[PDB]
Amino acid sequence: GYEVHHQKLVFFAEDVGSNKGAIIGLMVGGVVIA
Amino acid sequence: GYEVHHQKLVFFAEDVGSNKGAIIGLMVGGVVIA
Amino acid sequence: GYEVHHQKLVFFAEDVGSNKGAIIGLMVGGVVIA
Amino acid sequence: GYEVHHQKLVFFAEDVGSNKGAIIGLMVGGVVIA
Amino acid sequence: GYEVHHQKLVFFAEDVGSNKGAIIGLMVGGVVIA
Amino acid sequence: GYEVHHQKLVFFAEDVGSNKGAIIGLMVGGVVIA
Amino acid sequence: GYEVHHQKLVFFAEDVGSNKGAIIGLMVGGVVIA
Amino acid sequence: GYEVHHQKLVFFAEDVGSNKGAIIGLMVGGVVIA
Amino acid sequence: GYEVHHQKLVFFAEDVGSNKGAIIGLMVGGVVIA
Amino acid sequence: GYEVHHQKLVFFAEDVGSNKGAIIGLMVGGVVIA
């Protein structure tokens, strides 16, 4: 018998304020210019 | 017997205020200019 | 016997206010100019 | 009998303020110019 | 009988302020220019 | 001065033959039974 | 002066033959039963 | 002066034959039963 | 003056045959039952 | 003057045959039951 519970993944846990750049959770490939 | 419960994935957990840039949860490929 | 329950995926959990940029949940390809 | 509980993964635990660069949780491949 | 609980992984535990560079939690491959 | 060119994203680069299952490029939510 | 060129992202580079299961490029959320 | 070129990301470089399970390039959240 | 070229990331370089389980390139969160 | 070239990252360099379990390149969070 197996169980997994109350597992969490959070990228940004708290607030984001006044960014003038680039904020990305998960990026796969691509180009980011900030 | 197996179970998984109360699993969560959150990119942005708290508020986002006054961004003048680019905020992306998940990006695959593409170009981001901020 | 297997079960999965109460699983959630949330990109933006809290409010978004006064953005003057670009907010994208999921982006695949494309060009974002902010 | 096995169980795992209250396991968490957090990239950014506290707030992000006034970034003018690039903040990425998870990056796979790609180019980041900040 | 085995159990694991209250295990956590945190990349950035406290706040990030005014970055003008590049902050990445996990990077696999890719190029980062800061 | 910045430029990005000849960037491509391809889900299936070569041919698909005689599938009796389910082939999906991008899936968001939903249920797939194959 | 910055440039990025000839960048590619490919999920399946070669052919797919006779699948009786499920092949998905990118999956976000959802349930896949194969 | 900076440049990046001929960068590639490939999930499956060669052919996939006769799968009766589940093949996913990128998975974010969700449940996969194979 | 800086340059990066001919950089590659490949998850599966050669062929995949007759899987009856689950093959995932990149997985973020979620539950995989094979 | 700096350059980096012919750099590669490969998770699975050779073929995968007849798996009845779970093969994952990169896993972040989540639960894998094989």
Residue numbers in the entry:
A (entry chain E), B (entry chain G), C (entry chain I), D (entry chain C), E (entry chain A), F (entry chain J), ...: 9 to 42
Paper passage:
Adult individuals with Down syndrome (DS) develop Alzheimer disease (AD). Here we report the structure of Aβ and tau filaments from two DS brains. We found two Aβ40 filaments (types IIIa and IIIb) that differ from those previously reported in sporadic AD and two types of Aβ42 filaments (I and II) identical to those found in sporadic and familial AD. Tau filaments (paired helical filaments and straight filaments) were identical to those in AD, supporting the notion of a common mechanism through which amyloids trigger aggregation of tau.
Type I and type II Aβ42 filaments were present in both DS cases. Type I Aβ42 filaments have a crossover distance of ~30 nm and are composed of two protofilaments packed with a 21 symmetry. Type I Aβ42 filaments, representing ~50–60% of the filaments in both DS cases, were reconstructed to ~3.2 Å resolution. As previously reported for type I Aβ42 filaments in AD29, the structure extended from Gly9 to Ala42 in each S-shaped protomer. Type Ib Aβ42 filaments, reported as a small fraction of the total Aβ42 filaments in sporadic AD (sAD), were not observed. In contrast, type I Aβ42 filaments and type II Aβ42 filaments are formed by an Aβ42 isoform ending at residue Ala42. Type I Aβ42 filaments have been previously reported as the predominant type of filaments in cases of sAD with abundant parenchymal Aβ deposition in the form of core plaques, while type II Aβ42 filaments were found predominantly in cases of FAD (AβPP V717F and PSEN1 F105L mutations), as well as in other neurodegenerative diseases, in association with parenchymal Aβ42 deposition in the form of more diffuse deposits. In the two DS cases, we observed both types of Aβ42 filaments, present at similar levels. Our cryo-EM study shows the presence of type I and II Aβ42 filaments, probably reflecting the presence of parenchymal core plaques and diffuse deposits in the two DS individuals.
